[PDB]
Amino acid sequence: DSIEDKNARVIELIAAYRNRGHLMADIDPLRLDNTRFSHGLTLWDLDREFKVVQRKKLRDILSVLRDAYCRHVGVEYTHILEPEQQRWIQERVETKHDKPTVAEQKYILSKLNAAEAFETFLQTKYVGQKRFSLEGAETVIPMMDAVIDQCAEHGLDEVVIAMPHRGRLNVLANIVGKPYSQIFSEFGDVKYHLGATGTYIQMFGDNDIEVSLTANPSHLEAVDPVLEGLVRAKQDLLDTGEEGSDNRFSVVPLMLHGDAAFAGQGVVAETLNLALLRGYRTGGTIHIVVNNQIGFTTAPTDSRSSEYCTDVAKMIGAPIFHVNGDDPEACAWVARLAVDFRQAFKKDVVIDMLCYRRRGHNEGDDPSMTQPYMYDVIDTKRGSRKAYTEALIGRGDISMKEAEDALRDYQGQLERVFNEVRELEKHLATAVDKAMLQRIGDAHLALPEGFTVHPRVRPVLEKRREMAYEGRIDWAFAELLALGSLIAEGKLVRLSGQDTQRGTFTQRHAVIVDRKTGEEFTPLQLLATNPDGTPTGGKFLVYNSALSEFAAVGFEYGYSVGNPDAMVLWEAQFGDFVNGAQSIIDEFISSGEAKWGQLSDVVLLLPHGHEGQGPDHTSGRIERFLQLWAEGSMTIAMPSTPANYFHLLRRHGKDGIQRPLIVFTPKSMLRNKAAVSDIRDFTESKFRSVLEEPMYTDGEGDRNKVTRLLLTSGKIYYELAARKAKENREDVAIVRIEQLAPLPRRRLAETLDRYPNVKEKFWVQEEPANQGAWPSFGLTLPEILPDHFTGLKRISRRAMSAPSSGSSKVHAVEQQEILDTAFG
Amino acid sequence: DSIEDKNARVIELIAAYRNRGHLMADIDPLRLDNTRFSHGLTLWDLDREFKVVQRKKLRDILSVLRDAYCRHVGVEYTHILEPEQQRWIQERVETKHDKPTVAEQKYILSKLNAAEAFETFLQTKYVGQKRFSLEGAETVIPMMDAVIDQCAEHGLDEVVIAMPHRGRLNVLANIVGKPYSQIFSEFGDVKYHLGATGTYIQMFGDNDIEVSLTANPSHLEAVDPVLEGLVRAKQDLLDTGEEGSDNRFSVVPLMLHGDAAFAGQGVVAETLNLALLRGYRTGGTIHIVVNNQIGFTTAPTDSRSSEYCTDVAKMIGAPIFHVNGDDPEACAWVARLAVDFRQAFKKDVVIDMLCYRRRGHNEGDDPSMTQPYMYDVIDTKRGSRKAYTEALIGRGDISMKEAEDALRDYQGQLERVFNEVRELEKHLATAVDKAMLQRIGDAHLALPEGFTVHPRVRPVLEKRREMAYEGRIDWAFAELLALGSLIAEGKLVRLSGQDTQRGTFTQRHAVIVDRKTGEEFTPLQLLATNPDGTPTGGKFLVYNSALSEFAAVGFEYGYSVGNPDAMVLWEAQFGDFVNGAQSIIDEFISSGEAKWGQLSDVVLLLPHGHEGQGPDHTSGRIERFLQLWAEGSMTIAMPSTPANYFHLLRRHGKDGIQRPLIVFTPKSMLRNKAAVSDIRDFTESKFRSVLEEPMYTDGEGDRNKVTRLLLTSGKIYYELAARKAKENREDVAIVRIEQLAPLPRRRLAETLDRYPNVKEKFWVQEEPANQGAWPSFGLTLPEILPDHFTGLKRISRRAMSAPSSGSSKVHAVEQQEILDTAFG
Amino acid sequence: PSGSALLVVKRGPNAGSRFLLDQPTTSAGRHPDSDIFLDDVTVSRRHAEFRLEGGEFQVVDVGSLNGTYVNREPVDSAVLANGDEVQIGKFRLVFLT
Amino acid sequence: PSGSALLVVKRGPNAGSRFLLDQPTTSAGRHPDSDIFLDDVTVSRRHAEFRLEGGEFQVVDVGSLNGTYVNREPVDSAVLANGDEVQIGKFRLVFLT
Ligand SMILES: Cc1ncc(C[n+]2csc(CCOP(=O)(O)OP(=O)(O)O)c2C)c(N)n1
Ligand SMILES: Cc1ncc(C[n+]2csc(CCOP(=O)(O)OP(=O)(O)O)c2C)c(N)n1
Ligand SMILES: [Ca+2]
Ligand SMILES: [Ca+2]
Ligand SMILES: [Mg+2]
Ligand SMILES: [Mg+2]
């Protein structure tokens, strides 16, 4: 072995530390794994010089490599595909670090004092707080503080936090800055689920930054896409980020996690997947995993199939720093480095804080029952605050007097919280003018100079200008008429979903693509400018989503929470795939207002209808949304006309009420020649929750001849009306319930009273008997209106375990059976 | 720059190709990115020798590196943490490859002939097949064939496929081997969703292997955990893998995906996360992504935030091979290498097949509307079969005569399918004995020699032996009595969920841990051996799951499909988190039998009940399961007694019917002193769908005194009975409906007829009016039994948008309001 | 079986099936009008011929894509002996006198 | 304000609040009985003292963890001048004659 061999071995040894040094780093404060701690070189090569461009001794290369990668920080970065990102990390991690000042060390110790005094109070004063204990993980408080401080050092506007329950009240008091009089007002509680806002002031700098905490259910990680949507709405408002004039992304998401949930919940990977998308990016999220190496009673070997709980973050080439929770200086240093990386590259950074869970998962849990080895080790562990104070004395960083000052400060914080809580205990029109319709029609033909329209798209543009002036406005254009007029009035409109720009049924064309250059044109964006050239203040933000339901619906819900003034619509490819977002629907959309006072105006567009395309292309599960509904929680509709859908959307965007809207939208009814509206229906009408046939309101129809009343909703009305016209059946009338919830009790009663000779009333639906509106209407209508619906019968498909048959032939037979029964 | 500098530059250049060569590989058959295609060395260093242990010229190092990493295969492996796995790949990828024989090339060409003739027939004969077209991706057929052949070369038992719809009928015909008479029996269809089995025979080898295809909904990726459960049940049956006597894992999962869904669906990461878990591993899955660089109308830049659609696979350190779909030899070679890796290391391998989508997404779609550049390039592309035939001629591998033989073979396959389809068109007791109960009690104290029981666990073991002999058997022991007796009778029992070994409410203790050594003991596993020492054939497979609902419920459903003879139970931590698995419940559990004829006997255990712990710790959403139900789809129950839960489980496991069971299980009722059963209830009874108070069946109660009948289900019975006893109210009786679905019409009527003096009947429930059993019972009971329930009224919590209030104080007031109304 | 031969399918979807060789030419292939119909995509429409001339029984490949094997050896034509194995696509046939 | 001084909070949760200095010793800290109650976890229970002796106004740190600063400079004790900025934890106070 010559010098050439020794040189080669040194280069490979350098690469081995950079790549795999993290596998030998002293990251675990419990040291649970005994066996945890290139070889062509020996002791004789230690003082030999090697090219690095300077010549360095092997012992110096080794001390730099060991300090950078094998101490209390495990660095994973060589999986990153961008070489400039690898160099940036390598240079900051391999340089000699400046020791913190005494004032910085004392400040970190002051945050450990605050975190431990809060935990000590929480565990002593109340029973049932063990499940929320931050004991063994208090270092997360100086870590989060360093994140927020570093964001303030960059002069950013706000840090928005999402986190599970563990240490939440400690974060409210010591990070958000909420006083104990507000935190301990009642006697876990709703307090572990509510949102909050506060102001963070730098200790050593000149800036302030807003700090907020979003609301969340107990469902671990479900809030992750909600936080991103909320941050993105705040960034769009501040004219920062993707849809802003600056590239600062000055609203930062700070996302906290547990080790078992971070690996097990699919919504994590769905949310990471959004990190660099044009429609969803927030300029990089700062993640903190509180890695206590346990999940209730479950060991990490039963929770994940990889070395680290953070390995899913490699999905987007994010850097990952595993840091020892017993070293608060390294924890604060990693936090500042994470923020600097996020600012330089606009990409997620993951901090894996290795720590422990001092207590059992909850009250009455002796965790040594299932993890005796771990808890025999934890019973010998001294706290973070005492260990750090002792480290500072031993290093000579602080005197014994200064350590006494710190213990004094600690006892004073402990006295303060115990005494404060003790004293607290003993104390508009939706119609637009013709000019608006024409302008939105004209916008579809106001193409940029030399734009080449696809020959199949050109008739759509020309038909819209034609409809705007002549009428017979179809469903797809009425939607764009509603969104376009809101933009012209100054509203921000965000529309997204799978293939939503063009539309699943090739009906929308909200974005059109140049046949020769691939250039995009958005006709509705022209409505953001008044005829005089001044901006209206409005905007059209239309995107194709990722192929996700859970993260996409969660993002749109969060976006609507972040900007109550925006019109926010999410569209399912088919309503049948929205069950993929069931956790978001159950935990945020349908219930957030009642549980947390958190309001959302999000719209869900669910393509729905029996057309013979199978059980996954037929239903948005109307029955499930109706079951979730309670007075004032949501508006649920199934409009049958383009103009009534237009009025519904305009009412939703202009009512000054924050309440989700669920719309069951059409598929074949988009091109049904009878399902078109007149210009007058847009300029001289409003949203009608109950509709009659045009022969009674506009024609020469006789309502006194009617003996059989058919109540329905959706596209089946047109088939019922076609059979009625062919068979010339004046004895039968069809009434449509456009607004399914809240039930329009008053309008329904007034409409039914115009038919004094009805002997029998039937609810007609395409859906099986256990589905559609019948399970709720069948029960509620006779109770709510007994003089109108006592004796109401059902006409539907038979009850089924799936939304429909898989056969289009069976569908057709069943569809003809419903019409034959309705007119039998 | 000396030799030392040149040497260093060569080592770094070697590392750069291994790490990042894949970024320059010619993987895209469309070459859409023009800009796609260490530097201290020059032309003068090309013939200089460098240490590699042999000395090699730079030009030779470069040709090996370029051939291995920069041709038609992009290799990603240096992210793998196991060095032995990196070496294994590096050695197989950097060695000189033996060119395939003419017979192997001709065989691959025969598979391209088969794939293209099938596609040509499918697109010509039927309308509405464009959405399933495999045109531009036909190479997936020789690729899958090479996977299955390589599994047969290892002498494995079966390959089980899960895939979306694209090319499914082509896979049925050309991989599974189903004849056209079965494939084209009807006129997308249910055929794209059904399961199938076949026999694969090696062309050049001596083995056969079974090939099956699992059923699936349209929900992309939802089947992924279902496939894993199915494979794991098949491996357990064959005594292979984790729970087998051999380490062969001789049932192989072959999982197909699309590029947009693989990145966007969270269930992918949840399923990868299961790959090395003891309770879920299947010895590695072979993944194939049909990467056509599009998702309906959406470009990859709107679908993912990373370089590759396969980057989520880095979550588990899986190797990834990006292969050019226009090179079928490299595609077949990567497939064989993937199987060899899977066999050597029992870990997933991902194949990213880069290809294109020749047609629009469906009928009437001109894809140049949204992707004009891509489709102008695709319109110039010649097919895979013609290009490969032309490559073989140009290389001199085949003569012009042999190429003519191949074209002849192709036309013959085309004629065969067109003509065949043309002709097809013109043509037991659940009770156990006392000895069984005692044996299961005794098993809890039959500890291994020197086992140290935790002092808090010891009373549980002793109380079970006591209950087995003396009675007052609680809920937790009755469950183990049911599972234990099934094992003793020879049944395989699989039980899993979050913290399911110990139990969320510290009640199960199915596995106990040695206080000093951490050793595990499973008392019920002793029932797998008869008193004579012979095995019963039974087994207890009990695990703690990952922190997942979607993948965990999907796995248990697939496991039950894979082994209809197993007792399979999944347990939610609280029923409130099962909505995380809503896609599995809607698409497989509740509906798979009606849609595909696919049967499952899976059990879902859902902890449920109003106890003041908030809207995420109260409800399993009984109302949602009841809404999904249709005759013969599922059994839904809420037992109130330990013995009735025991009989329910034994009936489910012994009835010889494959039908899912939904059980709403207790929390505080586990330790309710009144909710205990006698020995006699286990030895001399059966499952009772309707229960009366023990004062009428066993006591001195007078049913003729009853004027008010209270119908209920669950734990509220005990509070209703306590109030009745305290107030001595003989005029009120309480009837329990234990089986919620199918409604026990006959037993309910017989029970109500024993109270001839009832004037008023009320349905009593803890749940809000829009939740629990009332929305379905309120509507169905008066219709089904009009002489018993016409006039039935409700007593419940008010209708809410969440399962409960967040306040335990409000809960207590509401709970007392229900009892006060019931006895008002 | 006076002067005749038998082909028995040993490997393939119709394992156990027997074909009699007693005509001058006996066609084997995927065409349904083949004398010996071997229904697998690995078999060409026109694949092989079993020719009987004088006393010898011969197998001849007639332009198939995957070829014809006699006792694991590829052949254009071969005189068959008792107990020989003929491979036509994935099918394995035993020749018997 | 004859011979007295004023402290005005410029940075902190109570920005705009004014404290009068006219006693011999004026305590500043997190204890609610402090003369100047500065309610932030960065402030120690007993943190600083504003001492008036003769004509000079002095700030003195009484054993706080995060210390006391005068015009961005850490001090154990310092004579205050008109317009000086005193930092006690995250609070910034301006001293005025
Ligand atoms: C989606 C979901 N499933 C299940 C639960 C129940 N649960 C509460 S805590 C817990 C374990 C959490 O483990 P980890 O994520 O490591 O966090 P830790 O409690 O250790 O901080 C589980 C399964 C939940 N709240 N959410
Ligand atoms: C979970 C789910 N969401 C939405 C859809 C609707 N859908 C059908 S095809 C498609 C795009 C698929 O893209 P990719 O996965 O790349 O597959 P490809 O069709 O290109 O093979 C979508 C969104 C679905 N079937 N399942
Ligand atoms: Ca609104
Ligand atoms: Ca059964
Ligand atoms: Mg944890
Ligand atoms: Mg695709």
PDB file of N, CA, C and O in Angstrom, chain A residues 769-770 774-775 778-779 791-799, chain B residues 629 743 745 748 774-792:
ATOM      1  N   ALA A 769     -82.745   2.807  -2.389  1.00  0.00           N
ATOM      2  CA  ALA A 769     -83.602   3.191  -1.251  1.00  0.00           C
ATOM      3  C   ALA A 769     -82.807   3.590   0.022  1.00  0.00           C
ATOM      4  O   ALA A 769     -83.258   4.472   0.742  1.00  0.00           O
ATOM      5  N   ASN A 770     -81.648   2.949   0.299  1.00  0.00           N
ATOM      6  CA  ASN A 770     -80.801   3.282   1.463  1.00  0.00           C
ATOM      7  C   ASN A 770     -79.831   4.446   1.156  1.00  0.00           C
ATOM      8  O   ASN A 770     -78.989   4.794   1.995  1.00  0.00           O
ATOM      9  N   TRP A 774     -83.725  10.130   0.136  1.00  0.00           N
ATOM     10  CA  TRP A 774     -84.808   9.416   0.839  1.00  0.00           C
ATOM     11  C   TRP A 774     -84.510   9.042   2.313  1.00  0.00           C
ATOM     12  O   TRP A 774     -85.402   9.277   3.119  1.00  0.00           O
ATOM     13  N   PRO A 775     -83.360   8.475   2.736  1.00  0.00           N
ATOM     14  CA  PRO A 775     -83.230   8.088   4.155  1.00  0.00           C
ATOM     15  C   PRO A 775     -83.447   9.241   5.130  1.00  0.00           C
ATOM     16  O   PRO A 775     -83.995   9.000   6.205  1.00  0.00           O
ATOM     17  N   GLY A 778     -87.382  10.999   3.892  1.00  0.00           N
ATOM     18  CA  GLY A 778     -88.426  10.043   4.247  1.00  0.00           C
ATOM     19  C   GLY A 778     -88.810  10.128   5.708  1.00  0.00           C
ATOM     20  O   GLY A 778     -89.981   9.956   6.059  1.00  0.00           O
ATOM     21  N   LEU A 779     -87.818  10.443   6.562  1.00  0.00           N
ATOM     22  CA  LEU A 779     -87.987  10.576   8.007  1.00  0.00           C
ATOM     23  C   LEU A 779     -88.322  12.019   8.428  1.00  0.00           C
ATOM     24  O   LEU A 779     -89.199  12.204   9.270  1.00  0.00           O
ATOM     25  N   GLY A 791     -97.914  10.381   4.668  1.00  0.00           N
ATOM     26  CA  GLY A 791     -98.319   9.446   3.628  1.00  0.00           C
ATOM     27  C   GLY A 791     -97.388   9.468   2.430  1.00  0.00           C
ATOM     28  O   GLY A 791     -97.654   8.775   1.443  1.00  0.00           O
ATOM     29  N   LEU A 792     -96.288  10.280   2.497  1.00  0.00           N
ATOM     30  CA  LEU A 792     -95.294  10.390   1.423  1.00  0.00           C
ATOM     31  C   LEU A 792     -94.649   9.033   1.214  1.00  0.00           C
ATOM     32  O   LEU A 792     -94.230   8.394   2.188  1.00  0.00           O
ATOM     33  N   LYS A 793     -94.619   8.586  -0.052  1.00  0.00           N
ATOM     34  CA  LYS A 793     -94.054   7.299  -0.460  1.00  0.00           C
ATOM     35  C   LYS A 793     -92.804   7.510  -1.301  1.00  0.00           C
ATOM     36  O   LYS A 793     -92.540   8.617  -1.754  1.00  0.00           O
ATOM     37  N   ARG A 794     -92.029   6.443  -1.488  1.00  0.00           N
ATOM     38  CA  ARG A 794     -90.774   6.469  -2.208  1.00  0.00           C
ATOM     39  C   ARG A 794     -90.843   5.737  -3.550  1.00  0.00           C
ATOM     40  O   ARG A 794     -91.444   4.657  -3.646  1.00  0.00           O
ATOM     41  N   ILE A 795     -90.174   6.322  -4.575  1.00  0.00           N
ATOM     42  CA  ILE A 795     -89.927   5.704  -5.879  1.00  0.00           C
ATOM     43  C   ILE A 795     -88.412   5.812  -6.092  1.00  0.00           C
ATOM     44  O   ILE A 795     -87.882   6.918  -6.178  1.00  0.00           O
ATOM     45  N   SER A 796     -87.707   4.668  -6.094  1.00  0.00           N
ATOM     46  CA  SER A 796     -86.257   4.656  -6.239  1.00  0.00           C
ATOM     47  C   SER A 796     -85.731   3.323  -6.739  1.00  0.00           C
ATOM     48  O   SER A 796     -86.501   2.396  -6.986  1.00  0.00           O
ATOM     49  N   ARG A 797     -84.387   3.211  -6.840  1.00  0.00           N
ATOM     50  CA  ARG A 797     -83.767   1.932  -7.127  1.00  0.00           C
ATOM     51  C   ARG A 797     -83.858   1.130  -5.840  1.00  0.00           C
ATOM     52  O   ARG A 797     -84.012   1.738  -4.774  1.00  0.00           O
ATOM     53  N   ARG A 798     -83.800  -0.210  -5.909  1.00  0.00           N
ATOM     54  CA  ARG A 798     -83.840  -1.013  -4.678  1.00  0.00           C
ATOM     55  C   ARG A 798     -82.608  -0.709  -3.828  1.00  0.00           C
ATOM     56  O   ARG A 798     -81.593  -0.265  -4.373  1.00  0.00           O
ATOM     57  N   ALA A 799     -82.692  -0.938  -2.504  1.00  0.00           N
ATOM     58  CA  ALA A 799     -81.564  -0.769  -1.583  1.00  0.00           C
ATOM     59  C   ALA A 799     -80.401  -1.655  -2.043  1.00  0.00           C
ATOM     60  O   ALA A 799     -80.643  -2.753  -2.509  1.00  0.00           O
TER      61      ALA A 799
ATOM     62  N   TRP B 629     -75.206  -0.741   4.810  1.00  0.00           N
ATOM     63  CA  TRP B 629     -75.813  -2.063   4.861  1.00  0.00           C
ATOM     64  C   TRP B 629     -76.930  -2.225   3.841  1.00  0.00           C
ATOM     65  O   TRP B 629     -77.666  -1.283   3.550  1.00  0.00           O
ATOM     66  N   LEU B 743     -81.755  -6.497  10.810  1.00  0.00           N
ATOM     67  CA  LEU B 743     -82.707  -6.287  11.905  1.00  0.00           C
ATOM     68  C   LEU B 743     -83.361  -7.619  12.257  1.00  0.00           C
ATOM     69  O   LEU B 743     -83.804  -8.328  11.350  1.00  0.00           O
ATOM     70  N   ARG B 745     -86.181  -8.987  12.916  1.00  0.00           N
ATOM     71  CA  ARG B 745     -87.632  -8.788  12.791  1.00  0.00           C
ATOM     72  C   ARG B 745     -88.478  -9.791  13.608  1.00  0.00           C
ATOM     73  O   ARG B 745     -89.346  -9.359  14.373  1.00  0.00           O
ATOM     74  N   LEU B 748     -87.654  -9.723  17.535  1.00  0.00           N
ATOM     75  CA  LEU B 748     -88.128  -8.448  18.065  1.00  0.00           C
ATOM     76  C   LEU B 748     -89.646  -8.505  18.326  1.00  0.00           C
ATOM     77  O   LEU B 748     -90.080  -8.179  19.434  1.00  0.00           O
ATOM     78  N   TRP B 774     -81.100   5.492  15.357  1.00  0.00           N
ATOM     79  CA  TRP B 774     -82.379   6.159  15.048  1.00  0.00           C
ATOM     80  C   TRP B 774     -82.589   6.535  13.559  1.00  0.00           C
ATOM     81  O   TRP B 774     -83.684   6.261  13.084  1.00  0.00           O
ATOM     82  N   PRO B 775     -81.660   7.144  12.791  1.00  0.00           N
ATOM     83  CA  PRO B 775     -82.011   7.526  11.408  1.00  0.00           C
ATOM     84  C   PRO B 775     -82.488   6.359  10.548  1.00  0.00           C
ATOM     85  O   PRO B 775     -83.364   6.572   9.711  1.00  0.00           O
ATOM     86  N   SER B 776     -81.970   5.133  10.777  1.00  0.00           N
ATOM     87  CA  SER B 776     -82.416   3.960  10.022  1.00  0.00           C
ATOM     88  C   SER B 776     -83.562   3.244  10.729  1.00  0.00           C
ATOM     89  O   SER B 776     -84.528   2.904  10.058  1.00  0.00           O
ATOM     90  N   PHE B 777     -83.478   3.034  12.064  1.00  0.00           N
ATOM     91  CA  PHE B 777     -84.531   2.356  12.845  1.00  0.00           C
ATOM     92  C   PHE B 777     -85.836   3.136  12.842  1.00  0.00           C
ATOM     93  O   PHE B 777     -86.902   2.531  12.702  1.00  0.00           O
ATOM     94  N   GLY B 778     -85.739   4.459  12.983  1.00  0.00           N
ATOM     95  CA  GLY B 778     -86.879   5.372  12.990  1.00  0.00           C
ATOM     96  C   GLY B 778     -87.712   5.263  11.732  1.00  0.00           C
ATOM     97  O   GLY B 778     -88.939   5.387  11.780  1.00  0.00           O
ATOM     98  N   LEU B 779     -87.038   4.981  10.601  1.00  0.00           N
ATOM     99  CA  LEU B 779     -87.661   4.832   9.288  1.00  0.00           C
ATOM    100  C   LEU B 779     -88.058   3.375   8.989  1.00  0.00           C
ATOM    101  O   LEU B 779     -89.153   3.150   8.474  1.00  0.00           O
ATOM    102  N   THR B 780     -87.188   2.391   9.309  1.00  0.00           N
ATOM    103  CA  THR B 780     -87.435   0.986   8.971  1.00  0.00           C
ATOM    104  C   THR B 780     -88.398   0.253   9.934  1.00  0.00           C
ATOM    105  O   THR B 780     -89.257  -0.469   9.430  1.00  0.00           O
ATOM    106  N   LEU B 781     -88.254   0.396  11.281  1.00  0.00           N
ATOM    107  CA  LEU B 781     -89.103  -0.317  12.261  1.00  0.00           C
ATOM    108  C   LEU B 781     -90.633  -0.109  12.047  1.00  0.00           C
ATOM    109  O   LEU B 781     -91.335  -1.125  12.061  1.00  0.00           O
ATOM    110  N   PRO B 782     -91.191   1.124  11.823  1.00  0.00           N
ATOM    111  CA  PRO B 782     -92.650   1.234  11.609  1.00  0.00           C
ATOM    112  C   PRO B 782     -93.119   0.572  10.308  1.00  0.00           C
ATOM    113  O   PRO B 782     -94.237   0.058  10.274  1.00  0.00           O
ATOM    114  N   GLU B 783     -92.278   0.581   9.246  1.00  0.00           N
ATOM    115  CA  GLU B 783     -92.584  -0.036   7.948  1.00  0.00           C
ATOM    116  C   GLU B 783     -92.592  -1.570   8.059  1.00  0.00           C
ATOM    117  O   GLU B 783     -93.577  -2.206   7.679  1.00  0.00           O
ATOM    118  N   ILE B 784     -91.497  -2.137   8.589  1.00  0.00           N
ATOM    119  CA  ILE B 784     -91.230  -3.564   8.743  1.00  0.00           C
ATOM    120  C   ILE B 784     -92.208  -4.208   9.758  1.00  0.00           C
ATOM    121  O   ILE B 784     -92.797  -5.244   9.434  1.00  0.00           O
ATOM    122  N   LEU B 785     -92.425  -3.587  10.938  1.00  0.00           N
ATOM    123  CA  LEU B 785     -93.362  -4.107  11.940  1.00  0.00           C
ATOM    124  C   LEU B 785     -94.391  -3.017  12.303  1.00  0.00           C
ATOM    125  O   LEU B 785     -94.283  -2.391  13.363  1.00  0.00           O
ATOM    126  N   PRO B 786     -95.405  -2.769  11.432  1.00  0.00           N
ATOM    127  CA  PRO B 786     -96.386  -1.708  11.728  1.00  0.00           C
ATOM    128  C   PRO B 786     -97.310  -1.983  12.919  1.00  0.00           C
ATOM    129  O   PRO B 786     -97.808  -1.026  13.499  1.00  0.00           O
ATOM    130  N   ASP B 787     -97.530  -3.249  13.307  1.00  0.00           N
ATOM    131  CA  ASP B 787     -98.407  -3.523  14.454  1.00  0.00           C
ATOM    132  C   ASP B 787     -97.665  -3.331  15.785  1.00  0.00           C
ATOM    133  O   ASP B 787     -98.301  -3.289  16.840  1.00  0.00           O
ATOM    134  N   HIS B 788     -96.339  -3.170  15.728  1.00  0.00           N
ATOM    135  CA  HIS B 788     -95.501  -2.992  16.908  1.00  0.00           C
ATOM    136  C   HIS B 788     -94.921  -1.584  17.036  1.00  0.00           C
ATOM    137  O   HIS B 788     -94.874  -1.062  18.154  1.00  0.00           O
ATOM    138  N   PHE B 789     -94.464  -0.974  15.916  1.00  0.00           N
ATOM    139  CA  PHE B 789     -93.761   0.311  15.980  1.00  0.00           C
ATOM    140  C   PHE B 789     -94.456   1.536  15.322  1.00  0.00           C
ATOM    141  O   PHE B 789     -93.818   2.591  15.254  1.00  0.00           O
ATOM    142  N   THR B 790     -95.735   1.449  14.896  1.00  0.00           N
ATOM    143  CA  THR B 790     -96.368   2.668  14.369  1.00  0.00           C
ATOM    144  C   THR B 790     -96.669   3.544  15.579  1.00  0.00           C
ATOM    145  O   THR B 790     -97.433   3.150  16.452  1.00  0.00           O
ATOM    146  N   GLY B 791     -95.972   4.667  15.661  1.00  0.00           N
ATOM    147  CA  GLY B 791     -96.054   5.591  16.783  1.00  0.00           C
ATOM    148  C   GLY B 791     -94.785   5.613  17.614  1.00  0.00           C
ATOM    149  O   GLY B 791     -94.744   6.302  18.639  1.00  0.00           O
ATOM    150  N   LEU B 792     -93.735   4.843  17.189  1.00  0.00           N
ATOM    151  CA  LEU B 792     -92.444   4.779  17.883  1.00  0.00           C
ATOM    152  C   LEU B 792     -91.818   6.161  17.881  1.00  0.00           C
ATOM    153  O   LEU B 792     -91.762   6.809  16.828  1.00  0.00           O
TER     154      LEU B 792
END
